[PDB]
Amino acid sequence: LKVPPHSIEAEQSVLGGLMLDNERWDDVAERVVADDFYTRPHRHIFTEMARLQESGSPIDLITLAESLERQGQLDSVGGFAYLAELSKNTPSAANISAYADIVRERAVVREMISVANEIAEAGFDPQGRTSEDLLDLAESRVFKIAESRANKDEGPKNIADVLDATVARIEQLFQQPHDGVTGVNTGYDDLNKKTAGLQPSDLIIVAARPSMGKTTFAMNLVENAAMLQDKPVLIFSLEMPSEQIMMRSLASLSRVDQTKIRTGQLDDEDWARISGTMGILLEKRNIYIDDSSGLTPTEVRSRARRIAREHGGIGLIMIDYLQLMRVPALSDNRTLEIAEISRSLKALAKELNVPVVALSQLNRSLEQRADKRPVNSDLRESGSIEQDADLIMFIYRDEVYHENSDLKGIAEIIIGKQRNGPIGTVRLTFNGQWSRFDNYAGPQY
Amino acid sequence: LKVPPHSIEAEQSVLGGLMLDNERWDDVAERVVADDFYTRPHRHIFTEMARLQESGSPIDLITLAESLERQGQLDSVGGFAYLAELSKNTPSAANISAYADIVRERAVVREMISVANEIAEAGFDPQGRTSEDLLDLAESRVFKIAESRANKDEGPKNIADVLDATVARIEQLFQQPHDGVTGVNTGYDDLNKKTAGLQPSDLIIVAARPSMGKTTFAMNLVENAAMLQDKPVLIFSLEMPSEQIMMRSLASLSRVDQTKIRTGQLDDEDWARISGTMGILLEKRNIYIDDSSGLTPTEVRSRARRIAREHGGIGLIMIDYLQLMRVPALSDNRTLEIAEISRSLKALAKELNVPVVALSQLNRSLEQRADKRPVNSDLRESGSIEQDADLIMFIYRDEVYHENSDLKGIAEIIIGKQRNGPIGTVRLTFNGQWSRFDNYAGPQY
Amino acid sequence: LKVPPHSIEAEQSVLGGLMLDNERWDDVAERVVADDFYTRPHRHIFTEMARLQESGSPIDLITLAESLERQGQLDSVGGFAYLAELSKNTPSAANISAYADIVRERAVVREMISVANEIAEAGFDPQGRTSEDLLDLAESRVFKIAESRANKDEGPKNIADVLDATVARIEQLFQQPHDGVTGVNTGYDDLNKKTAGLQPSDLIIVAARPSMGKTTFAMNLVENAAMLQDKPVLIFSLEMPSEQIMMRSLASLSRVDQTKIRTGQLDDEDWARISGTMGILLEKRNIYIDDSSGLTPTEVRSRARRIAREHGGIGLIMIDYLQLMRVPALSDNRTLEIAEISRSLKALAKELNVPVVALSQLNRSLEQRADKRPVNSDLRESGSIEQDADLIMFIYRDEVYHENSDLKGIAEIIIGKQRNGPIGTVRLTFNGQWSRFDNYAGPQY
Amino acid sequence: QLDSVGGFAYLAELSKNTPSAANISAYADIVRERAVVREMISVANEIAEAGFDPQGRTSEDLLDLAESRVFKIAESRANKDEGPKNIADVLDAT
Amino acid sequence: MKNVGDLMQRLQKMMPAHIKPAFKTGEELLAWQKEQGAIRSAALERENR
Ligand SMILES: [Mg+2]
Ligand SMILES: [Mg+2]
Ligand SMILES: [Mg+2]
């Protein structure tokens, strides 16, 4: 009436089938796994059989027995007489994979019972924390085993099928007549060329030394998006709070100094342009800023999936100074912490089908180099971020280092990696009085 | 040891607290729910009191009993004598919303037990169900529960709330028409221009080589904002004790050289200014100094929360040469140690909304350059202090290096970083015999 | 468990191969010898067939027996009934050279353990003997083993071998069609020389920095191999999905740019060249692609063998950015995890008798160095995969680093190791606007 | 964590008890004072039994251990005049 | 799901008639590719110089 169900007749039938069907090892391997059994003697038999079918092909009854014997383990798993009882029975030929399907299905049910029992016990006696992390633990186990199982459409496919999807993309792009912006527009027209817009399943990075324009540039990207893109955007301001971000953004959008907003020393034209940018931003309701500090990728995925289901689907994410992201499991090793972060953000971008602007600092290696243009290496930690990304674009503004420069008011965006587009060195104009980058219709580069 | 989790003293405690309090109801209503309880009589009491608080405002002992009678339910929820037990006990203090929140999340915990039971029920009872209708089903269950999430003070923060706060701050600033110093004053009228004062929550860093004047500069900032603001300032002199600091400060304010002070060889016009500055410093009672050596950030926090409690609220903090500050957990990896330190200081400034001065040092990377005018990369360790900061401002008085220099008595304050404002090069004048920096009326820099 | 190791299955298969093929005796004789075997009748048959293939050409079934009767040894090696089974078995294809080499290896091992026991006896049995004449015995024995070695290519050369090629120049060098290749044609004639093509039972490692073009190369290889062979090839793309891989490949072939493909700015003169190569890539159906994320080596094996059985036998395996491969057993220890995965891929290369393309990264140890032309150690994990691979080759395109260069458009393929030949350094040309390496027409290297 | 730290009624009993007055300073004083003594006798036991069990040790390398531990206690304790001093208390000593 | 016929038909739906590929085979492909490779290398080295 109540039990973790397991079909054991079908089980042993599959066993004896694998015994007296020595060709067919992979077909049942599509669905059966070593731990997938309900009973452990069968796990022993199957792991021996698998180890041999990798190396030693001919085994039905007896050479498997010798393999079991070479480590001195006769009768520890029942007995060879029982093994011959297995080989004798089940003369079935037609169906083994379906028996394997139902056995694995019952095993999945069984593991669901295991997980539910773990939840109930770790609701009764989970031994010490705040239950804010317990709700997250439930969601974590849930979505983890979701990702561990759900992908069973997976398999190598045919070019006559892959080209269908490829040509579908080429059709819907060749269909839609538009300029060379297949993605999210940045507003900067000389950067859309090297980028074709922030493509919808990537981990963009925007890095530079501390006071160079990371947050500034990134807010300008999301501003231009929100004004153009008619879908939400997220702003994970882990560093500094919303009430600075938004002054800075009002100035970016309306070209007035920050001082003349955090002082009230402003004139009618400025009052007006503020009213205008405000009355624009209110009507759309695009932006969603999180002013929380020490987030984890778990929480980022949670909040993003929340804004997704309700408000259509997001179109862009910005994450300020990535390195503040945490995962307390890996708090003893920092490089692996950043690696987990980067993988989580890439998987997020692949999940919701958006880009993920992810800022990052740089190390003090480019200081003892005399060029000061950052290279892809000079990223603050772990070097996975120079691998997991479809796009890096550093920033370099020469007037910070060179007062002898004739290149001031000019900030150039040193692309440093782009898997599906060109390297380059874009050039733009910096006016930090109102925290904006603008286009530089000037000489070439 | 193992039991369905539920708390009941908090339950009756909250209920009686509401019985003795008609004023404060909405705050608990924002957290607790009818179904939030374990036992049904108290569910009836809660929902009836809530219906009345919608309709009938006064509900302490008899209005609720009369209502529950109007629905004909006395003795179904215990009894009016039992309710007299509820109204008699729990006279507890304002710690009521704490009870509300904890019981809210206890309903969430009991929900977790129930939902794990539901999953285990679907598990034991497969009902001939497919794995693809099993996992995503039981996982969208927890997802649907996550959808509730009445903690609506986090990431899904629409823009209008941000702008509400921002306009509120701009009204805090424009409703008071004053000079262009929205922050702490320094006294240095040339510095407030590039700075707009020391902002209350930012982390300021003052940095120079060992005899360039940073303790002095910082003491002048604190002992000037002690004379202007009627609000306290702390001093964590981890490096030198009070009996040198205060001597130095008397010399600073009273402009008499320190050698005439301690040696006792000073004249009447000096003794007068000593009398005057002391009579000021004691007729304001505004300065606190902690001469402890190896302070961890928790100690710094506690010792600042105290003064932020007793003496109103504070207005400035100064920490001398933070590389003394410890956190013994991370004693092996110095870099992570300093990062913890800086993060703690920033968090403190954001917690109290008061400026943290945090003196730092510089590495010996200037000396092999022939310029010596420091940059952010010349900070002593970790590079976080050049990331978790909002105002670095160095000190470079040139006669230390170039003996034959036409800048003796000139100390320039190289603002090397500032988020919410410009960089530059302030000039001052160094008069060290009485340990002061003074303003400079001079040519165009 | 513990036994004298000797191959017997492949042994009899080689012997029956010599039976059913009088041609293949020369190169197999260059490796296997009568003393190279384990049991006696195999040695008898080998020495008989050696004496006869010297003089008596026809030996498959009968002339062996005839000579065996000439010397009068019937029923000494089994019998003609024992012999008939040998010609009966092993209908195998041309894969005999690898069998011969591994049996040579097994003979060398058998000699090694024999010598080990001899030395153990010599140590236990001094027989009134100084250890001088005992360690000298052991060392002379070891050198007599490793001296002969049947190997004359890894090391210096006597002048006889030098003058062979030197005088062969002056007479015989009309050999400029040196298409001497055994394995998968890489598609690069300047490269196919130094590598002798992909030997079909090895492990390839293609590695460089991210913006450098390695994935483009390891796509060009499978891209050519799909066309030249009529054999399937696999693509495990653990980084990015199929829809970008194929959009790259079409552009590599057709000689147009990805941009016009994903944009639609392309006229007849590109349309034709896309249609042609598309038609070619459909009319063979070789390539299979797997856009997984977190594969385990077990799944690599399973998904190579699901296809190795159906389609004859696969020709090439291509893994993308290896390090993503996990095994949840070693989810903590990274080093042994990587070493496990490397050994597993090498085991698969042995199993299916196919070449394994499996990429990797380079740590940031070259970027603190002006050379930047990588080496065997700059290999990002474990120092292990420089041992489990018969081939490594790295890349270097200087014009990512130096903008001033006169080495641009050019990309040397450093070969860092080979265990079946000499290393070298190819010099291709890179034109990433259509994502291709081309064979270079230029001066020396 | 319930019932590993006593009980729930056990917890409530402590609240029900001690309505005593503001002499919290002195109570916490003695409660702090006794534990350092407890640690002191603990260290005394450790030093003595370690003397019984040298483990490749000499007296020179042993009185050093004694000095080290005792003063590591003393310095870690002795700094109990700490705090942010009001300015009058500073200027008095100045 | 789809074959050469249906796929190339949907391809002609993108691009009009008389677009004949001028390869038709596996060897002329690589041959013309090497031709264009050397021709490109010519102007490439020219641009460098
Ligand atoms: Mg920033
Ligand atoms: Mg100092
Ligand atoms: Mg790649």
Swiss-Prot record, chain D:
Source superkingdom: Bacteria
Parts of the chain that traverse the membrane: none
Induction: Slightly induced by hydroxyurea.
Secretion signal, residue range per the UniProt entry: none
Subunit description: Homohexamer ring. The helix loader is a DnaB(6):DnaC(6) complex with a cracked opening large enough to allow ssDNA into the central cavity. Component of the replication restart primosome, which is composed of PriA, PriB, PriC, DnaB and DnaT; DnaC is required to load the helicase on the replication fork DNA while DnaG primase associates transiently with this complex. Interacts with PriC alone and in the DnaB-DnaC complex, probably 1:1 binding with PriC. (Microbial infection) Forms a DnaB(6):lambda P(5) complex in the presence of ssDNA. Lambda P helicase loader reconfigures the DnaB hexameric ring, generating an opening large enough to permit ssDNA into the central channel.
Entry comment, domain topic: Loader protein DnaC alters the inter-domain and inter-subunit interactions of DnaB, inducing an open ring conformation that allows ssDNA to access the interior of the DnaB(6)DnaC(6) ring.
General function of this protein: The main replicative DNA helicase, it participates in initiation and elongation during chromosome replication. Travels ahead of the DNA replisome, separating dsDNA into templates for DNA synthesis. A processive ATP-dependent 5'-3' DNA helicase that acts on preformed replication forks (have single-stranded (ss)DNA tails). ATP is the best nucleotide for helicase activity; GTP, CTP, dCTP and dATP are poor substitutes. Participates with DNA primase DnaG in primer RNA (pRNA) synthesis during initiation of DNA replication. Has DNA-dependent ATPase activity.
Similarity section: Belongs to the helicase family. DnaB subfamily.
Protein name per UniProt: Replicative DNA helicase DnaB
Organism: Escherichia coli (strain K12)
Organism ancestry: Bacteria, Pseudomonadati, Pseudomonadota, Gammaproteobacteria, Enterobacterales
Name of the gene encoding the protein in the UniProt record: dnaB
Curated annotation (Swiss-Prot), chain E:
Cellular compartments per GO CC: DnaB-DnaC complex; DnaB-DnaC-DnaT-PriA-PriB complex; DnaB-DnaC-DnaT-PriA-PriC complex; DnaB-DnaC-Rep-PriC complex; primosome complex
Subunit text: The helix loader is a DnaB(6):DnaC(6) complex with a crack opening large enough to allow ssDNA into the central cavity. Can occasionally be detected as a component of the replication restart primosome, which is composed of PriA, PriB, PriC, DnaB and DnaT.
Entry's family note: Belongs to the DnaC family.
GO MF term list: ATP binding; ATP hydrolysis activity; DNA binding
Residues of the full protein shown: 1 to 49 of 245
Function, in words: Required to load the replicative helix DnaB onto single-stranded (ss)DNA, to initiate chromosomal replication. Also loads the DnaB in the replication restart primosome (composed of PriA, PriB, PriC, DnaB and DnaT; DnaG primase associates transiently with this complex). DnaC alters the inter-domain and inter-subunit interactions of DnaB, inducing an open ring conformation that allows ssDNA to access the interior of the DnaB(6):DnaC(6) ring. Has ATPase activity only in the presence of DnaB and ssDNA.
Protein name (record): Replicative helicase loader DnaC
GO biological process: DNA replication; DNA replication initiation; DNA replication, synthesis of primer; DNA strand elongation involved in DNA replication; replication fork processing
Induction section of the entry: Induced by hydroxyurea.
Coiled coil: none
Keywords: ATP-binding, DNA replication, DNA-binding, Hydrolase, Nucleotide-binding, Primosome
Tree of life domain: Bacteria
